[PDB]
Write a protein that binds this DNA or RNA. Sequence first.
RNA 1: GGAAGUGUGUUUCAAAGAAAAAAAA
Lengths: 100, 553, 50, 44, 150
Amino acid sequence: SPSFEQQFLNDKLLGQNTLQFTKVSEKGTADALFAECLESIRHRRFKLDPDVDNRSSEAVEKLTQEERAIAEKIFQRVDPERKIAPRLESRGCYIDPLWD
Amino acid sequence: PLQALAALPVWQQGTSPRSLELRSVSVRLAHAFMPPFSTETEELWCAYTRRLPVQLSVDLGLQIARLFASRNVVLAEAWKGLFASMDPLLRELRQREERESAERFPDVVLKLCEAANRVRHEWTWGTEELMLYARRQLPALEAPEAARLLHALASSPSTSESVVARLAEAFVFLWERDLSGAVEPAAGLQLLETLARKRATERDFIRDISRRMHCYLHLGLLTPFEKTRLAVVYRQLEFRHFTFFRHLAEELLQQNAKRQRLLALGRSEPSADALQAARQHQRRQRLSRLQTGEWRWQEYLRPGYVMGLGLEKDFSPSGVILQEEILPLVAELRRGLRGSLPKAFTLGQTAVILDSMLFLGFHHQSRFFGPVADVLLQRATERGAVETLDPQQCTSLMVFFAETRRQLSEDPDDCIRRLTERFVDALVCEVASPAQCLLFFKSLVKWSATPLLLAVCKQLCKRVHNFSMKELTGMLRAIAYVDFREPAFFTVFVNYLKERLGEMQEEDIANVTQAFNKAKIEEPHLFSLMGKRYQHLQANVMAVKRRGVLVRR
Amino acid sequence: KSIKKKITGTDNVFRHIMEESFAVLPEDGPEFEEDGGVSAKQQKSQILSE
Amino acid sequence: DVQPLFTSGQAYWQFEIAKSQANHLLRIRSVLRRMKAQAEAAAQ
Amino acid sequence: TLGGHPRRFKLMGGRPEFHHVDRNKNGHIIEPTDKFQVVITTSKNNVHAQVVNKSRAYRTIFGSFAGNVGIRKQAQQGTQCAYRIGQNIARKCRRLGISQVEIKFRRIMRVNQLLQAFTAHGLGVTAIAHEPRLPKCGQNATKPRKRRRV
RNA sequence: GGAAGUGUGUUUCAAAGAAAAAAAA
């Protein structure tokens, strides 16, 4: 059962950035056992999942160009020495782990 | 001569199974008896092929193609007729397979293209059909079939590099894990060769395959044939691996050291070249039992033979442990490091390996090249060794001498002359490719800077459409710098160059002007056209004095 | 490069350092870590398990 | 329907990026399951 | 009104084109692998254009000016003279076998005409360089000339 | 040293040049 990283993240663009969502635990630990149980249960529930859970909405412009310019200026003022970027690795600092 | 061709059962016109069986037996006996195609045997092959529009079978056509590949039948008419008579069978098979879904056609077409590549003949229709099949059904093929199709397409000389690279990228995306986890040396080597032949950028996959091959080499499960092929493919890739080539140099040095150790004493082992010559003699005897340099040419043209590596069957794994000292050269170990964050080479094989090292530039920035170069000089200057060599191995030796001009302790002028005679015999007998020939000639000119030539010139004059402006102009310069001074031989090519004005690069124009300024020959129109071409080509470069080149293109 | 405009006779100390490094880290080895630097280690410390 | 409130604009930037990625994955999953259903119906 | 330099025309030794130009050891004025640069020196009264082979240590091949093209006195100040000089340079480059050149100059006035003539007559330009060599020491390190009209 | 190239650490020219215009080939 190849995972998403096994399947698609070997491409250049897809493989460039790959965030980590869960801590890696060595085999033989309570965390590993619980992760295995959760993965099995989630796969079985994915099998017994309904259609409504995969509903998607059309993509639209999140911001206007002028609003994007304003946001860029404000982010630059927030960090005037560094470049503005979505530092998804440093994400935990800005968004609490429980609300990721 | 001519008795076998007169007596063979060739006179029977019909579609009968008896006729087909008699044709199959006739071609079997042709394979057994007829000599390789060359200067000496030309009329025989012409007449045989002309006699052989015509009704054939799949097996018969495959046998004909294999025989032509083995015997180097490069005559255009023979292939023209063979494809003209094959078109009906292939079309019928294609329609049959199409209707069934709505031998095998792709397999037959691939085999024909392989034969055409072997004889260096181009089959545009077959190559295009294979390209369409690849673009249409690449995901369908399993890993080995896809690898074979990609290798054939890359070996083809007209397939577009961009398209081949995109197909290789898709293949890697599909089967990077299984191959990189468990791939045999032969499959990995073929993958590396197909990547190199079209310059596909697969850095990570190439590195992983190289790591697995190096694990094989460390374990000692690799033959000299495979090691030389690895060196050649790394040279093609410009893969400047340091530890691998240091390991090869150390292997050569220790082999020579043991050779001398046992030669000093009363008991010594036979030489690898001696064993190869004995095996070649045994194969010649086997052929005679079944029935100038025909007995060597057949051995070189045997199906399992590779130009710079001899015959793949003779060579076997080097040994579990070959270096007593710790070798200069696995996935679990890679994972651990990431987590922790801390049986013998031939003379020609040695020549090819050192040619690869010279191309990669080890001779300058290395400490393990000088001793091996001295060893190669010692083994090459000996009489007899140069005579039994391939055109590509001779080119490698010539390159080695030319590059290590100064480093040579002695002056092997006799060895160089004998090598040149051997290579010229190969060239006039058509076993030498223009790519291997231009390198040899340029290397000889470089070595000399600081009859045989007539035969070379006549071969060049008769075979003009086999190579590109690169080789044409480079050889035109090499002959003039060797010293030819033939107004006719030089003025012949003026019109050919005028016609192929377009395909001339800066290197090409440089070679042409060098040749025609060394030969003291005047051609105002040629020079004017070449000058305009050079101006146009350089129009997309700007440079300033004392500041180098600023913007290119 | 021109012989009258380049630098010759200098030691390839960087190449020697690379060659000696090959000993501690095999040349046929990983080029990066599981966590690629300060940012990756921050992510590792700031991601929860299950 | 109700989304959280953060103290910095970085958080909203990353939240929007995550939302877009999740929606694209949802579209892919829906298309895959529709193809699954079509294949099952054709087989039966 | 010969449209050329009267004295060069009169003393032309049998009229072999490029008879007086020194040639390489190979007997060629131009090698098939040579690049060419046109240096233009413009002024109020005249424009001097020199074609130079860069490969032969930036060696002048031939040149032209108002007198060479057959323009005398006040007529040398107009744009017609500059365009005529450009046309002459382009035509002689075509005759020799020069197609692509690099332009260089110090004063930019009266250079547009030469560039336009080159483009019209097919003398391609691969690059342009303005080398004014401005003073980097002062303004009156050497007292310049007196201003006209007091 | 000038100008370039890429089987290389390669080649070529070389210690001032320039003596109508416009064409043919």
